[PDB]
Amino acid sequence: MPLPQIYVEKTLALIKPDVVDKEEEIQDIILGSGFTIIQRRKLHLSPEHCSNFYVEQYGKMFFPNLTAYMSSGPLVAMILARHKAISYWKELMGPSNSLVAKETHPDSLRAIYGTDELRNALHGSNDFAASEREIRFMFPAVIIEPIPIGQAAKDYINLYVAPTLLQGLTELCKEKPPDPYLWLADWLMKNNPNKPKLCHF
């Protein structure tokens, strides 16, 4: 961070199916406030997706209405980014509970568009690490974080990748197959420890 490099702060920002119809006004206020939108995408989270998206807090937020309000129609997620992105987005939002924001923050977007505690118009990152977690969930294959140049990449590989890759390459060495990449890649697909074995018969 005190590198030669210079830094962009990024935050997730959602609109629920009872507010998606007013996507355009919300995006207008977002752009006018000084944010820059990196990517749009239209979602429709099934309850399995809802259980995984709040997985940091789904073990405490036992709200079936909260799953329905993500599943009862499409969503509009965005990456927003500007100078102090998360705090400025929080300032526009206000309190997370819209029932408090309606009376105490007239300027809040949640007061303007939201309805109540669970029918909150907007959801976004409440923390930078939470920002990386939710953005890596919802929009795969988008670089958002500092790159782990040093030992952190080695730890990542040794904890996730190496315990499978070592053993697969070891069997590839026993067989010595032709065009070895098929053997490695099909082996990794078939015997992934993080997934079940699929028998297409």
Binding site: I147, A153, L165, L166, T170
Partner: protein, 46 residues
């Protein structure tokens, strides 16, 4: 058999160097953005 000491250590070093080269690329790009845009605001207002 014992590839755990043989080859993966080399490959971890090569991932480290390739990510270092990637960071060099990102840094050079960032300097390019600074140079272009600082040349823009300074000269545009003059």
């Amino acid at each position: 058999r014992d590839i755990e000491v043989g080859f993966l250590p080399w490959l971890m070093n090569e991932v480290e160097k390739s990510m270092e080269h990637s960071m060099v690329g990102r840094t050079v790009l960032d300097m390019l953005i600074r140079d272009v845009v600082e040349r823009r605001i300074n000269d545009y207002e003059h």
